[PDB]
Design a protein around this ligand. Structure first.
Ligand SMILES: Nc1ncnc2c1ncn2[C@@H]1O[C@H](CSCC[C@H](N)C(=O)O)[C@@H](O)[C@H]1O
Length: 392
């Protein structure tokens, strides 16, 4: 119950002689007051910081100097994968995030702390100054139009979330008001952003997206990575760190070989479209219809020639490609896809993953070795990292 934190575990929690301590730093001198058990482990729920570590300044690592965050990620990857992996710093570590979902509740605007309690905020520094402006306009909108907001105790109220998105390289901003059934007052006199959306979440789930009801201004905003534009819709996924996303698409384009590329699990075509712009012959697949539709829209606005189709990893053919890129969901690569890759043996596989343990698992099953690998800090202030591996 007393001692110095020696390291962080893989979720970012301080390790003191096999008790866990959240938001602690190696080198912290602490006294553990209260313990609790979380999945058969002792977790320090009340502790006293006696001496602060010199490493100190979802953001569970935000109390740590950035260089130490990167050191923690290097060490974690080496533990999981078995060897040193370079970690590329995010070009920016505040203002880098291009989407935030703010809950709008009786007792404040921000996010759940103690799930029943809201943390009220005036700005979100990882998103940047646009959030301060949106929040301040939102308060005026709510106040002057007397808008009913979420009462979390009863789960009643009209307005639930304000989701803010922006293109870091285009300066376009989209705001999306997610509500229950109702009538949203005209938001046009309160916001000056390029796109304003009203979405109605008609399910019982607490979610920060819903059915598109109306938009004012642009139907889509854009983000731009180098010379490639990507349409952003309230309901479509896009890498959340625009600055690192630039390094990620460049890195993928550098690792592929040949001319014929498969962009497997393409989503909205982040890799495939960038590669088509660079002159590759690209086909991409994803099981999500809406994502594929966005990828097709992206092909059009960039005037490239690439094809995207909806298919499951259980069925996709990998025949006839020079490089196959895979960016699988949390489950990793379907076993049938691994069999197909083993049989067809494309010259190069590029595997992108923010789940190092699943990557490590799948690579053992593939008849390939790691030729090159780097991690990109896509997720500053969290324990997560994005790996990009070239397999041959
Ligand atoms: N069983 C399956 N078969 C094919 N696609 C799947 C799948 N399960 C999930 N997906 C898709 O797998 C993708 C993983 S995220 C991939 C991100 C994409 N490369 C981008 O840059 O934006 C998602 O787009 C998801 O819709």
């Amino acid at each position: 119950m007393r001692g110095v934190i020696r390291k962080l575990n893989d979720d970012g929690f301080g390790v003191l002689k096999g008790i866990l301590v959240p938001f602690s730093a190696p080198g912290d001198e602490i006294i553990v007051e209260r313990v609790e058990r979380v999945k058969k482990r002792r977790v320090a729920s009340q502790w006293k910081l006696v001496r602060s570590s010199p490493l100190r300044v979802g953001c569970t690592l935000q109390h740590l100097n950035y260089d130490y965050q990167l050191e923690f990620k290097r060490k974690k990857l080496k533990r999981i994968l078995g060897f040193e992996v370079e970690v590329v710093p995010s070009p920016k570590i505040f203002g880098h995030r291009n989407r935030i979902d703010l809950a709008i509740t009786k007792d404040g605007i921000g996010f759940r702390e103690k799930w029943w309690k809201i943390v009220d905020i005036d700005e979100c520094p990882v998103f940047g100054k646009t959030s301060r402006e949106a929040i301040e306009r939102l308060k005026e909108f709510i106040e002057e139009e007397k808008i009913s907001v979420w009462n979390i105790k009863k789960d009643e109220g009209f307005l639930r979330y304000m989701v803010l998105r922006e293109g870091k390289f285009t300066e376009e901003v989209m705001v999306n008001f997610v509500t229950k059934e109702g009538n949203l007052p005209d938001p046009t006199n309160y916001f000056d952003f390029d796109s304003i959306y009203w979405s109605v979440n008609r399910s019982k789930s607490d979610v920060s997206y819903g059915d598109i009801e109306r938009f004012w201004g642009k139907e889509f905003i854009r983000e731009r990575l180098d010379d490639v534009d990507y349409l952003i819709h309230p309901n479509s996924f896009f890498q959340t760190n625009s600055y690192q996303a630039v390094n990620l698409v460049r890195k993928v384009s550098e690792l592929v070989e040949g001319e014929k590329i498969l962009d497997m699990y393409s989503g909205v075509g982040t890799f495939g479209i960038y590669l088509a712009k660079r002159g590759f012959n690209v086909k991409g697949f994803d099981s999500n219809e809406f994502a594929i539709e966005m990828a097709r829209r992206n092909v059009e606005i960039n005037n490239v020639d690439a094809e995207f189709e909806v298919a499951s990893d259980r069925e996709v053919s990998v025949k006839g490609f020079d490089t196959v890129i895979v960016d699988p969901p949390r489950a990793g690569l379907h076993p049938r896809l691994v069999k197909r890759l083993n049989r067809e043996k494309p010259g190069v596989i590029v595997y992108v993953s923010c789940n190092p343990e699943t990557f490590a698992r799948d690579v053992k099953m593939l008849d390939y070795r790691i030729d090159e690998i780097v991690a990109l800090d896509m997720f500053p202030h969290t324990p997560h990292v994005e790996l990009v591996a070239k397999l041959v």
